[PDB]
């Protein structure tokens, strides 16, 4: 989706501030050339879009769209690619029209699209073009939402946008209910090793597959194991073929990051109840069981990359070695004889990664430092330590070490003799604060991770996994998640309708070999032509039992839960089923951030800003308005003097806190004196 993305900004295009309101809307010519769902939802709505599925670009740069041509009411198979203008020249039929299995419609009054984007009921002889299928007006990432036609447009926008922020888990189980777009969208994404030519498997391993073609020649496919992506995630690739198997051309031979057996897999399948539980799932919070923490269900790798370089200076050249001044030999036991750490060493927050020492020069010595050196006999140690230390809030093992050197004759920028890169990886679990979401815009952070015992278990001892909330469902108009939940329970338990007296009436248009299905069987309801209400309800009434004869879920889709905490049953049956949820890239460890005293700025004297540094929060303008409106003048004076700019005041504040005295009176900030010096510099006698 980063490819096939259509924008209007950039060079040669309109600016964001100069963006007209009319160019953000959906013109009626967008049907089949641009998705009216998938777009960013910040201050960039409609300026960035994605292509449609069946779309195509002309040699001139216009956007073509296929259409089924139809002559005399008989729908042919001649597919004609139209552009917008000759689309407007003709009249365009509907995708889901009842065709008589002979080319012709069953009603003369068909839905149709006129020239200027109008919707009419034309007689079925003026129709000269039909759509090829449904899902023509939709993008790729939006065509992977089951029951899209039941969701509102805003929540489908949020679901299609959050479907690509999912992270790759370590097990990557395929979804139960999906569309038919996972397989094609995976094997066209390029992250799956496809067999280039048909042949037989000679040898598999964890690192390479060598196949034997039909005529002599062999080819080996080198996998990528634990390669770092562009945003820290992992990119494993494992085979799925055995030793003696036979493959064909185009067959999937190795999984990718988010794939299972060929198709896409962005999350896991989890049992879910829709009850409001004790205020822990209040206002879109989510609670989970402890089974997901125990059994590594939502855990992912994260790989980070550090870097340091030994330049050359005026006084000499910085050297990479072990002889760090004034540092105990207890923390120098990890790294090897040449300074860098060894592969496999677990590091904490603040340990030494690359030993680096710089020349410093000569300075005068204070009498107290002179007397301590005279007492202890320690030498001067004229070189200064600037080593590479792992930043705050990080840990994990050390995967790889890549070192470039000047003596080994590689290309480097001028004056750099040694570049060394260390790859630290950690196995992040799930935790409270992390953000989860379904395929329908129903996001929400994790409120609490309960133990497995105090979690409302089913009628036969099975505990549920997540607990959603009811009040967020009806006022957001996305009951597609409820239909997905019911059909997920049906697809997990397995069904078998009874064809003793023929097929029942609700399953007449239901296709064959869905009259019975094994448990844990996958299905696919496509985007705009999928399950119906009568089909799903009749299929939910006949849903064969588990181990004993116990239909755990009645005909409405609900079940009689037990309270795992007190012990009594809940007095009313609760909707249960099997949803498909994904773990997002908004983890807490990239967000939690604090500062007592750290690095300061250079031009101004304010504390520096950003999570990459220690960083302080911006006490902005409206916050000053709130502090004035309360009347708290002293807190505002403190926040604007001795926490930002009073350069003689910060050391006195730290001294007063450490010694235990009262905080002294604030002075003039630095910004005001800078303003005074500028106004005096601009030939204005400010007095």
């Amino acid at each position: 989706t980063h490819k096939r993305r259509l924008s209007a900004l950039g060079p040669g295009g309109l600016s964001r501030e100069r963006a007209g309101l009319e160019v953000r809307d959906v013109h009626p010519s967008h049907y089949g050339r641009m998705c009216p769902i998938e777009t960013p939802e910040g201050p960039n709505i409609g300026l960035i879009g994605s292509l449609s599925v069946y779309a195509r670009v002309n040699p001139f740069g216009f956007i073509e769209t296929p259409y089924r041509k139809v002559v005399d009411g008989v729908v042919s198979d001649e597919i004609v690619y139209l552009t917008a203008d000759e689309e407007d020249r003709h009249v365009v039929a509907q995708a889901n029209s009842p065709i008589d299995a002979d080319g012709r419609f069953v009603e003369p009054r068909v839905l149709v699209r006129r020239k200027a984007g109008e919707v009419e009921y034309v007689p079925s002889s003026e129709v000269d073009y039909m759509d090829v299928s449904p899902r023509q007006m939709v993008s790729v990432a939006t065509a992977m939402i089951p029951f899209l036609e039941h969701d509102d447009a805003n929540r489908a926008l949020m679901g299609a946008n959050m479907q690509r922020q999912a992270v790759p888990l370590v097990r990557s189980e395929a979804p139960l209910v999906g569309t038919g777009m996972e397989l094609r969208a995976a094997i066209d994404a390029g992250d799956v090793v496809v067999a280039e030519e048909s042949g037989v498997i000679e040898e598999v391993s964890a690192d390479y597959i060598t196949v034997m073609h039909d005529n002599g020649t062999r080819r080996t496919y080198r996998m990528r194991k634990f390669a770092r992506s562009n945003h820290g995630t992992c990119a494993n690739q494992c085979p799925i073929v055995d030793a003696g198997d036979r493959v064909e051309a185009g067959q999937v031979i190795a999984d990718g990051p988010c794939t299972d057996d060929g198709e896409m897999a962005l999350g896991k399948n989890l049992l879910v109840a829709i009850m409001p539980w004790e205020g822990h799932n209040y206002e879109d919070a989510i609670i989970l069981s402890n089974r997901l923490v125990e059994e590594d269900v939502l855990t992912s790798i994260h790989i980070e990359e550090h870097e340091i370089d030994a330049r050359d200076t005026k006084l000499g050249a910085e050297e990479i070695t072990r002889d760090i001044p004034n540092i105990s030999d207890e923390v120098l036991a990890d790294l090897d004889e040449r300074g860098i750490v060894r592969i496999g060493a677990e590091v904490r927050d603040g340990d030494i990664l690359v030993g680096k020492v710089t020349p410093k020069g000569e300075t005068e010595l204070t009498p107290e430092e002179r007397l301590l050196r005279a007492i202890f006999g320690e030498k001067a140690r004229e070189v200064r330590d600037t080593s590479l230390k792992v930043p705050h809030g990080e840990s994990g093992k050390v995967i790889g070490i890549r070192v470039f050197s000047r003596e080994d004759e590689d290309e480097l920028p001028a004056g750099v003799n040694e570049l060394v890169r260390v790859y630290v990886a950690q196995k992040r679990k799930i935790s409270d604060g992390d953000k989860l979401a379904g395929r329908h815009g129903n996001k929400g952070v994790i409120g609490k991770i309960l133990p497995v015992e105090d979690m409302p278990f089913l009628a036969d001892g099975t505990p549920v996994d997540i607990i959603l909330n009811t009040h967020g469902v009806p006022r957001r108009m996305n009951i597609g998640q409820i239909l997905e939940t019911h059909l997920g329970w049906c697809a997990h338990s397995g069904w078998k309708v009874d064809a003793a007296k023929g097929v029942p009436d609700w399953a007449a248009r239901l296709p064959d070999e869905l009259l019975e299905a094994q448990p844990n069987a996958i299905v696919s309801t496509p985007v705009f032509d999928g399950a119906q209400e009568a089909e799903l309800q009749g299929l939910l009434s006949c849903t064969l039992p588990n181990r004993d004869g116990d239909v755990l879920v009645d005909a409405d889709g609900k079940a009689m839960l037990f309270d795992g905490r007190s012990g009594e049953p809940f007095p009313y049956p609760v909707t249960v089923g099997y949803m498909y949820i994904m773990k997002l890239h908004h983890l807490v460890d990239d967000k939690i951030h604090a500062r007592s005293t750290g690095p300061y700025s250079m031009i101004t004297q304010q504390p520096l800003g950003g999570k990459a540094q220690f960083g302080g929060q911006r006490f902005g303008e409206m916050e000053c308005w709130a502090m004035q409106a309360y009347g708290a003048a002293y807190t505002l004076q403190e926040l604007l003097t001795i926490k930002s700019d009073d350069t003689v005041g910060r050391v006195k504040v730290y001294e007063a806190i450490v010694k235990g005295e009262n905080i002294p009176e604030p002075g003039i900030p630095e910004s005001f004196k800078v303003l005074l010096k500028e106004l005096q510099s601009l030939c204005l006698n400010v007095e």
Partner: peptide, 27 residues
């Protein structure tokens, strides 16, 4: 269907579409 090593994912669709999806990176 039309991909050899595919998992059998049974569909609920009623319409038999003529045209398969094009190459997704042809643009």
């Amino acid at each position: 269907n039309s991909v050899p090593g595919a998992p059998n994912r049974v569909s609920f669709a009623k319409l038999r579409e003529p045209l398969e999806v094009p190459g997704l990176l042809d643009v």
